[PDB]
Design a protein around this ligand. Structure first.
Ligand SMILES: Nc1ncnc2c1ncn2[C@@H]1O[C@H](COP(=O)(O)OP(=O)(O)OP(O)(O)=S)[C@@H](O)[C@H]1O
Lengths: 182, 192
């Protein structure tokens, strides 16, 4: 017996005040996530799509709070990364694989269990283009282009346990079509 | 005061004066009396457009009561030297020198507005001094009068004898008469 949207909403009421519309979105979205997982395109419903979430609000309202408190009652693996520490491929800053890597630390390197997890991103506006093109932006628009394929679904390469050193030269392939992003 | 406009481009937004925006499109304005400063400014504009593109037509709008002769002849020689066809349009009025630059435009690309007016007369001058000096300045202005009539006939197609009789005194020519006179090619009544 999985939790209902009303049950999970009451759980969040004990940690959030003055947010009705936002609770309904995460409750309905997380609920549908379990159903999409329960039927891995094996039932009559084939090719079950995905629907991510985009939270918008002022600072200090509880956006970071919802991501942490939600992981308590969910019990599936959850992580939290920062969009600020990202750049286009070929630059030292770019660590786009780290987000998937982090998820495995929480799941104890369980690929079958990491695909069924949830991920959250904070400070997404930091990479909005400034419409300045006559130059190349390592940070900003450039970063968004790399995330396109990651959300839709693909198989990123992850260094095992973050990579021991260069001699191994092997990577971990983990499907991402089923992973949710908030 | 000159109004400022914004030219939307892929690189970004740029602010331009109304006169500078039209200059980018091969358009030059000839306003007021023709003097050494105003004439020397238009010459630099024509040369700038020649280097940017030598195959695109230039448009010259003239609204002027005339002025110095020497200042105007610098523009005429420039229009003939450069390869691009300098299209001329008459707005409001075209005096003696304004008319000479009007007819000096490229053949087939000369227009006159339906209510425009052209006026032509002989060169004006004067001198004060010894009789020997008056004879010199008289011979010089006579050469200019003869020279200005020869070029007028070349572009208008009329005979030199006809230009001499018509330029003895002030002669106003309406827009329809200018076409019949060979001064212009057609009239831009409406946009088709
Ligand atoms: N809806 C809310 N209800 C109750 N308390 C809230 C709410 N939103 C924010 N708070 C309080 O504000 C604190 C900080 O909220 P945050 O989750 O950091 O907001 P934030 O938008 O995520 O800030 P960032 O991550 O720097 S953009 C929380 O620990 C709560 O005490």
């Amino acid at each position: 017996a999985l939790p209902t949207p009303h049950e999970i909403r009451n759980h969040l009421d004990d940690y959030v005040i003055g947010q009705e519309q936002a609770k309904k979105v995460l409750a309905v979205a997380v609920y549908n996530h379990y159903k999409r997982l329960r039927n891995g395109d094996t039932s009559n419903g084939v090719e079950l799509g995905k629907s991510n979430i985009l939270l918008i609000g002022p600072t200090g309202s509880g956006k970071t709070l919802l991501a942490e408190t939600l992981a308590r009652l969910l019990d599936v693996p959850f992580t939290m990364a920062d969009a600020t520490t990202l750049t286009e491929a070929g630059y030292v800053g770019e660590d786009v694989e780290n987000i998937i890597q982090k998820l495995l630390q929480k799941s104890d390197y369980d690929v079958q269990k990491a695909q069924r997890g949830i991920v959250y991103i904070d400070q997404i506006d930091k990479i909005s283009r400034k419409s300045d093109s006559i130059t190349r932006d390592v940070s900003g628009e450039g970063v968004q282009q790399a995330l396109l394929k990651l959300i839709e679904g693909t198989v990123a390469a992850v260094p095992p346990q973050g990579g021991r050193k260069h001699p191994q030269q092997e990577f971990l392939q983990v499907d991402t079509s089923k992973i949710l992003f908030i | 005061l000159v109004p400022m406009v914004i030219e939307q481009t892929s690189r970004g937004e740029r602010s331009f004066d109304i006169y500078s925006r039209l200059l980018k499109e091969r358009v030059i304005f000839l306003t007021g009396q023709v003097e050494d400063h105003m004439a020397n400014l238009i010459v630099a504009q024509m040369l700038f457009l020649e280097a940017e593109n030598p195959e695109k037509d230039i448009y010259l709008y003239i609204n002027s009561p005339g002025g110095v002769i020497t200042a105007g002849m610098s523009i005429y020689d420039t229009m003939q030297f450069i390869k691009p066809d300098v299209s001329t349009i008459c707005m409001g009025q075209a005096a003696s020198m304004g008319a000479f630059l009007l007819t000096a435009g490229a053949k087939g690309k000369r227009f006159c507005l339906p209510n425009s007016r052209v006026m032509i007369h002989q060169p004006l001058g004067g001198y004060q001094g010894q009789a020997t000096d008056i004879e010199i300045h008289a011979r010089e202005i006579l050469k200019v009068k003869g020279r200005m009539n020869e070029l007028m006939a070349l572009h208008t197609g009329q005979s030199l004898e006809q230009i001499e009789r018509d330029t003895e005194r002030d002669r106003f020519l309406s827009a329809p008469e200018a076409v019949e006179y060979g001064l212009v090619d057609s009239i831009l009544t409406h946009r088709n």
